[PDB]
């Protein structure tokens, strides 16, 4: 069937850096195949496809590299491969803003389960990867105590421990340790879970802290039991908490087991079926927090006893009746295990490979590797190809990169639119500062070994301190194998600096300079320090130093971070160790950091449209407010539509039922479209047969609301006549037949002859609720005019008489109706006048005055437009009216079904019409053109002088958005939506920001709420350099079992969140936010660098309309001491 081994130097890249992917193709057997290509596709987190290739193989091997984009979205990416099979093999790989480790951490306890009173202790082993051990490096940690449910790891499905056991999950005392011992340190706890009859586990999450700096954090787990062996329960039912369907019986498998020791036996196991009545709940809103929930009582329903012999899988079954139960087996010894359920709601041909490699080496000189393959024979069958890569070991430990082993790869068995042009999610938050961390990765060419299975590569190594990992893979046509080797690289004396990931301009940190002697002879040096760029030394370093062999002591370097955006640098010139051996006298080192401002960027949004020959320039004072260094702009130049938010509304279906307006407004648009247009208009209403069939129904239904005199009532033919709707209804019924519907003849006639008497004798007409009868009656008369006029049944005489009562008119809509009525029956000169008047008559938009036309400024335009499309009239105004209608989009909070339709009927127009635009620009002196709509990115200098001029036959529409850091902290700006930031502790209680020592964890609470529905929201919490997010997307490093106050976690879980990114300087969340609905975001961070840091304001924006943003309230300064 074909098997494709995908493999690479690593699975953790970092936005910016090039990716390497390798491939080998074999069959079901694992033998070679005929030479062929393999389509590879690169896949972004969301699901889209960045790029794709047809990888040709050179010499049995597939290779694929491509440069991962600086602003690429952090997530998990995939490369997948079509093997013609139409099953895609995926190669997953991480992209995160990540920091290679520079240290290691082994933590162990023996794997034997303890007993209740047995204290718990763990091993610690702190060691820098250049060789040295953490001598005196402190260690933060947290000791948790969590229920251990799947204790028998050879019987997953069986659950162990009393599911209702009070207080089983606690977070025990915090860990704190100098580990002065060059080797190590140790961590114990005394038992406090005497009581339990349930199997528990103690969990240690430990962080080994670099010198005034980052953590390298790992967790160890140490099981705990209460008996020799424990009772187990597997509920037979599935699909989660498991439950019986109805009042059916509760099927269970039941057992008794040792640590893994299968099936030990005792009789007298007391099985019970406990039920839980839960009544009473809630608490006053504005309790702060809000509400609370139910209390319960537990009563027994069976006391059935079951016996069990060794190797026996018990089986109890019990009928139940619609409540929350739980099954609770009690062992003689006293270990209990409950489980809860609710009845309702709510072969060796591998090639032996060995690697000749130094155990240790200095940097800057090539690393030579030699490869010999035993082949499990005298000599290795055919040609030996070997590919060999080298990777900084601190990169592979975060992923825990198992080296790729081809052998067991072959033989190893048993989304429509957001609007975010790519990539803007960052851009709007503001250019991130540039992160200079350098990753060390080399891959060699594939080698063909000799006839003795021997060969050698030389991987040139640069300036580096730490462990390397050499890895190699080998293949013949039929045989495969691999191996890895750990090659330390150090200097005679290491000096590596410690910095935060960035610094906000104004921030001040105290960088630590690690410096270790690996020479054996004591040495005396002078570390002369310079700082240039947007970074300056505040004070004066210790001049000279002195060290024994194998000892490091650090220097502290305090640093004012200068205003602006760019890069700062620290130069060390290190004098000493002038050598007749190493051939050296001095050594110069450089280190660089990114400086950005301390507040989030802003954006500005212009949109207009230009009929040919018009020119759009940009305001002079419009960008006046931004820092130009970091300002960029988009300029989408669509030639087909306006705002065109055909969506932002829907689904749309046929509702034949209800009163007369429900019914009419229910069907009125279903006349004019079908599934086709709909599943292509990005919305789907009704099966095409269900729509027609459902119109047919509402027709015959309306007819029965037709009174004798031919006009209509709301519910029955005996109803009080409703005047304006009688017109409306007819309009529908007339239109109906033109769209292939059957309307009875006279029914329509009885109605028309009535509509006439709407023109001739308004005296009869009495409108029930509405005032301004003058205007209400006029509006009625003109709708009735149109309708009859379409039929050629609107007598030119009566159209005049109403043409002079025109001063009564409230809206322009009637006039436009009456213009077209006139136009069509003769007398175009009144028509043209009545029309041309209509267009310059607006409605007062307070509209509580209630005229009985169900209208508004909003729809009467949408209809005045939907009219002109029909008659092909005054197309110049058509754009004008359309553009004014576009702008009813800001005012799209709660539209009626009449405004919806009347819009949708104007909107369905846009779909077909092209398209074609042409325009001159300030930039690209060439004529820009396009079939569709095209974006164009602009820098500061381009856009400050930006002008755009149409050049074509059609009008175009241009949107621009421009984003960059301002000169000065935006004052807190609530608009549409808004945002609070609260720094909670680890114990869930607001933390004094001045109270922070390094290594401390902190919980950040973002409450985001809105007055609209804003589905393209963008949360962007910038950071104070003091903090660094503890990334979860990864993790071998740190978790939200750590987070105690679930109040909020639970909430977060509900919210519709497209993605959360954890990035060097920014918390970023794309999300949908609503009214009546807050959106709780919580994210875990740590304080690393000591100093005093400016806290940005938290912000959020709507992607589509940037004017919808909320700069939240600025917090005070963050101070970190140690």
Numbering used by the authors: 385 to 623, 636 to 742, 855 to 922, 943 to 1562, 1566 to 1653
The authors write:
To elucidate the mechanism of protease-induced α2M activation, we crystallized and solved the X-ray structure of a porcine elastase-cleaved form of ECAM, a close homologue of SaA2M (81% amino-acid sequence identity) for which the structure of the unactivated form was recently solved. However, an alternative strategy of in situ proteolysis and crystallization with selenomethionine-labelled ECAM was successful. This method yielded crystals that diffracted to 3.65 Å resolution. Analysis of elastase-cleaved ECAM by SDS–PAGE and mass spectrometry confirms that MG domains 1, 2, 3 and 7 are absent from the crystallized protein. Most notably, in the structure of the protease-cleaved ECAM, interactions between the TED and the CTMG domain, which protects the thioester bond in unactivated SaA2M, are not present. Thioester bond release is achieved by the untethering of a large region of an unstructured polypeptide chain upon cleavage of the BRD that forms new interactions with the CTMG domain, thereby preventing the protective interaction with the TED. Specifically, in the elastase-cleaved form of ECAM additional residues (Phe947–Asn963) of the BRD are observed that are disordered in the uncleaved SaA2M structure. The buried surface area between the CTMG domain and TED in SaA2M is 1972 Å2, with three hydrogen bonds between these domains, whereas the buried surface area between the elastase-cleaved BRD and the CTMG domain in ECAM is 1438 Å2, with five hydrogen bonds between the domains.
